[PDB]
Curated annotation (Swiss-Prot), chain A:
Keywords attached to this entry: Ribonucleoprotein, Ribosomal protein
Family: Belongs to the eukaryotic ribosomal protein eL31 family.
Full protein name: Large ribosomal subunit protein eL31
Keyword Membrane: no
GO cellular component, one term: cytosolic large ribosomal subunit
Oxidoreductase among keywords: no
Alphabetical GO biological process terms: cytoplasmic translation
Oligomeric and partner information: Part of the 50S ribosomal subunit.
Source species taxonomy: Archaea, Methanobacteriati, Methanobacteriota, Thermococci, Thermococcales
HAMAP family: Ribosomal_eL31 (MF_00410)
NCBIfam families named among the record's database cross-references: PRK01192.1-1
Species of the source: Pyrococcus furiosus (strain ATCC 43587 / DSM 3638 / JCM 8422 / Vc1)
MF-aspect GO terms: structural constituent of ribosome
Swiss-Prot record, chain B:
Keyword RNA-binding assigned: yes
Biased composition (Polar residues): 353-364
Species this chain originates from: Pyrococcus furiosus (strain ATCC 43587 / DSM 3638 / JCM 8422 / Vc1)
Region (Disordered): 342-364
Name the UniProt record assigns to this protein: Large ribosomal subunit protein uL3
Role, per record: One of the primary rRNA binding proteins, it binds directly near the 3'-end of the 23S rRNA, where it nucleates assembly of the 50S subunit.
Keyword terms: Ribonucleoprotein, Ribosomal protein, RNA-binding, rRNA-binding
Subunit details: Part of the 50S ribosomal subunit. Forms a cluster with proteins L14 and L24e.
Family statement: Belongs to the universal ribosomal protein uL3 family.
GO molecular function: rRNA binding; structural constituent of ribosome
InterPro entries: L3_arc_euk (IPR045077), Ribosomal_L3_dom_3_arc_sf (IPR044892), Ribosomal_uL3 (IPR000597), Ribosomal_uL3_arc (IPR019928), Ribosomal_uL3_CS (IPR019926), Transl_B-barrel_sf (IPR009000)
Gene: rpl3
UniProtKB/Swiss-Prot annotation, chain D:
Family, as annotated: Belongs to the eukaryotic ribosomal protein eL37 family.
Source organism of this protein record: Pyrococcus furiosus (strain ATCC 43587 / DSM 3638 / JCM 8422 / Vc1)
Co-factor remark: Binds 1 zinc ion per subunit.
Keywords tagged on the record: Metal-binding, Ribonucleoprotein, Ribosomal protein, RNA-binding, rRNA-binding, Zinc, Zinc-finger
Gene Ontology cellular-component annotations: cytosolic large ribosomal subunit
Protein's name according to its UniProt entry: Large ribosomal subunit protein eL37
Binding site for Zn(2+): C19, C22, C34, C37
Functional description taken from the UniProt entry: Binds to the 23S rRNA.
Cysteine disulfide links: none
Lineage: Archaea, Methanobacteriati, Methanobacteriota, Thermococci, Thermococcales
Swiss-Prot record, chain E:
GO cellular component terms listed in the entry, alphabetical order: cytosolic large ribosomal subunit
RNA-binding as UniProt keyword: yes
Identification of the protein by name: Large ribosomal subunit protein uL22
MF annotations from Gene Ontology: rRNA binding; structural constituent of ribosome
Similarity-based family: Belongs to the universal ribosomal protein uL22 family.
General function of this protein: This protein binds specifically to 23S rRNA. It makes multiple contacts with different domains of the 23S rRNA in the assembled 50S subunit and ribosome. The globular domain of the protein is located near the polypeptide exit tunnel on the outside of the subunit, while an extended beta-hairpin is found that lines the wall of the exit tunnel in the center of the 70S ribosome.
NCBIfam families, alphabetized: PRK04223.1, uL22_arch_euk
UniProt cross-references to SUPFAM superfamilies, sorted A to Z: Ribosomal protein L22
Amino acid sequence: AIKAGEEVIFTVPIKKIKKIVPRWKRAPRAVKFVREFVARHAKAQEVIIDPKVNEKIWERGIEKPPSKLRVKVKVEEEKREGEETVRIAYVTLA
Amino acid sequence: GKVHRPRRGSLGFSPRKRAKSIVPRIRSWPKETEVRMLGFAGYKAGMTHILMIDDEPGLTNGKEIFMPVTIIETPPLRVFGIRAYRMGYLGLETATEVIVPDFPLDNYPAKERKGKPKPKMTFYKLLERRIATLPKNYTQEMFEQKLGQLEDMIKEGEIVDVRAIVATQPWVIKLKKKPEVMEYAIGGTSVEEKFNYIKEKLGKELRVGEVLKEGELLDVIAVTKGKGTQGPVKRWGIKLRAHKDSKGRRKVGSIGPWHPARVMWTVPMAGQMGFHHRTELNKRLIAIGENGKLKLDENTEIEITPKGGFPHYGIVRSDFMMIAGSVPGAIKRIIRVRPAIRPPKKKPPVQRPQITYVSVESKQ
Amino acid sequence: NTLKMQRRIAAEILKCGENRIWIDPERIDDVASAITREDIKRLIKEGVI
Amino acid sequence: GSGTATFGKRNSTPTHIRCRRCGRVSYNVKKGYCAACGFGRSRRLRKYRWSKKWKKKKNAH
Amino acid sequence: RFGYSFQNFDPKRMARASARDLRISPKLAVEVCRELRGMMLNDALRYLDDVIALKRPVPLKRYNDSQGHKPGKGFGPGRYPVKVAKAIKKVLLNVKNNAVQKGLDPDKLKIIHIAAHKGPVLRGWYPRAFGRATPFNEQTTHIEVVVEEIR
RNA sequence: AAUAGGCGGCCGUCGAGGGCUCGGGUAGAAGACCCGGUUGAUAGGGCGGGGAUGUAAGCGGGAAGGGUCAACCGACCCGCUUAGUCCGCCGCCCCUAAUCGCCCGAG
RNA sequence: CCGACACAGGUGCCCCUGGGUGAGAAGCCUAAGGCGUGUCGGGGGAAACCCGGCCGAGGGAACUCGGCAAACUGGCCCCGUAACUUCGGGAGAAGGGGUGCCUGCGGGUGCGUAACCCGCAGGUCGCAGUGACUAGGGGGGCCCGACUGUUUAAUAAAAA
RNA sequence: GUAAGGUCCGGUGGAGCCGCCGGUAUCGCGGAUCCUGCCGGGAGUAGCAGCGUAGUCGGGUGAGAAUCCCGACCGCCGGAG
RNA sequence: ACCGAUAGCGAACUAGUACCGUGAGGGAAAGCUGAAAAGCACCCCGGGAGGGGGGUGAAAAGAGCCUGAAACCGGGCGGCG
Ligand SMILES: [Zn+2]
């Protein structure tokens, strides 16, 4: 797994959702897929996606998101409000 | 009658419902004198084509012709049970059955993953994936005592038939771990001889080469590919409505007359298409391979697996059969074969024909 | 509050379309606090708008 | 035509406006008389026996 | 509405609460109450939390037209009435507080009676073709609950 | 199939056997069905095989000419280059996720 | 604003409109200005079927009351153009050839190597050069009414 | 009591009501595609598509945010929005 | 010896009022806490609406207020299933 503090590289395969959605929703579907993938793989209760990676996803318009996206994930523990410990992931380009 | 045409579709395959089980059943068996297991099971691998010198009767006899073939991989079956049938009031009834006790498994492809040694599988561990409730504290003494009781009933004469219960071994070809359990009838005219055959083969492995004969006809049983819900145009092949029709074109025009005041069961309708239990007759067995290789002239052997592997399927590693033509089912589907139950009067000789070319080029 | 009056007045003062007015995303509190045209001009001078 | 699209042309000068005499919005503006009390057409009020409107005013019907 | 349909309420051993004129579906309220009946208070609260989080379908036995089935045994039509679950959860918290104030152990509270009723309807209209105005109404719901400290 | 069946096994008089949840399709409108779930190659990632197009960007040279017949500009062509790009196909490697957990259940 | 409505109609499109391509206030792209309120969202190889589009081998109207729908042609330059005729026309009849980019010259008006337009030679790439957008299918008989125009607002646009 | 109907008991209600004789009447309800009011099944269903398919990521206010506000990205109209 | 709030004038009341049609003109629905507001002080919870205690009153008759039927809907109980 990933403990708080270190960073990892992931290769999100955005291509897996291109054909299950209409052509004009592919970009938001890819953003949602990236969020789900990062949360699942980092075991993070929350995910914070950088505007830079969002713009990378939206570069070629709403219809042509990149097939593969290489992202940098950094995990931290907040333990806020006393409701157990919440894991927050931060996603950045490359 | 004004204009007449044959009905759309066949009523002999109704209801067109999903198959009861994904493992095909065999309702009838061929009548034979040779004491052998009547059929075999395997997994669909793919299709290719060959060029051979035709030998069956016809104009193209002794000439080089093109023939498509379906390759199906057939890892050996494990004979692990024997079942006895008596005659009931309305039909055959199961008098009893007996299965061998647990034994170590010597063909499990275990790999030494870092940490812990090799798993050391044994039978009753792959079988519990299908049965899920197997005998506890089962020993050879009680197994032999049960076998003796079954033999004693056979001698008394209340047993009218005997069948062999076998299980597949997908783990050998690394397709899956859950096995599939079936029972096969045996040829011959003496229940005692059939029982002795099964007893000799109890707990052992059986290969296609020991049961099936190259060049003979077979019947193939499987569950066809699934297509989901389909409209009448594709399900029954009805005629499209006129292009000026403003209420659709892929639908039946009238679903019945005024009287009877009901919709008849013979009117084409939408519903499940595919994933049906079907049987195809008179499929010739071209060749039986071994270890994924085919011997052609005793000097050159070629690997049946095409370059890049079979599409949607792995690499053939065990014994396989090359059936002439097409077979129902999808890739990796379990397919059963039995000796032809209805062969023609004139049939090809029982021997491998002369093969001049085998297509092993990339199929994807 | 909804930054509508401030945006409209800033556009009027600067003589440009409202879509061409830029408000500092990290001084929303100050922009909302400004209520008069004098305050809006002061913010423009400071560079918040 | 003759239906919904026709009623969109009711943005011209209203046919009737308020009447200085009877206070009702019945003063034909283009012709110059009241369709209720006759203002601008006669000195005396427009009153008819087949009409109950002028009795409704004083609850005398 | 103020009165309850419970007969033998005992102020020494029982607590009660209600909500009136709730703007939710009375049908779904009835369906959820049918399932909540007879459960412990904590179990009912967890049930409602699962329904709100969409981790657990509510079966439909009376009002289930054109409703698809759900995975698992017993389904059969089911759905997730989030709004009804939220309102009923608030009512259950209120009754829990009433019991605690009376001095009843919250861990032994069993929902002995729970019911839903159709309250006043707020009328409205919507325009339709051919110059026709058609009813467009809201149906409000009353909820009543009384819990008992079991022993 | 109201004569609502036969057989081997497992459990009960705590408990076999399941459902939800997890990774995917030999399946699919909801349900249902099939394979996998650390007794692991189910999906992703890496590498290798096989494919579809058709030789990338960059650099070097030529080019009908023009230019002070100089510097430079120039459609296009040739070499590095079966290249570059991509893969809803296959093989090997536990590097990541198949986890934690919840509820029926005969008596 | 009127139409019962925060109505895809009508009133008011009543007056006005940067850049490229281009004959153009056409189509397409874009600056200014405006909007994300022609206001319910989420899921999915998640089907059948229905509406709106793109392509379909071989044949080419065998379909049908009837080529209904779709399809062919399509801009511009050059050559060439029938019966008939009221001599005006028919006529863009019909039919045929060309069209890109690049390197240099010649010409018209012009003070000009400003701006607009018109030809010429050579080299070169693609299946395709009005490459997208824009953008006629054609011909031959018969009946009726000379033509432009008007008509049953809400099933008849016609020979009336 | 054949009956139209009468009377009695238990409960709610809080100020009027009846037996008999003799008269009077807007004097007796199942229907009139009857009139007025209220409520049912259809149904948690259709509709919230078609003529311009537009949202996403960080931050903010707030009990509560797909729908409100600011920044970036991506889009629509651009002889009309 | 008239009716007693779907009756009686259309109007028992902010009724020839609201509202409909360009206009002539057409034209509704809607009465009642209690003897006295004594119209619920204080406490717990909820964002709030409200809920539960506790008070007032002969009686909540609690302003959504005299009595409170039928149709319809939710629950409990007895019988069938
Ligand atoms: Zn007047």
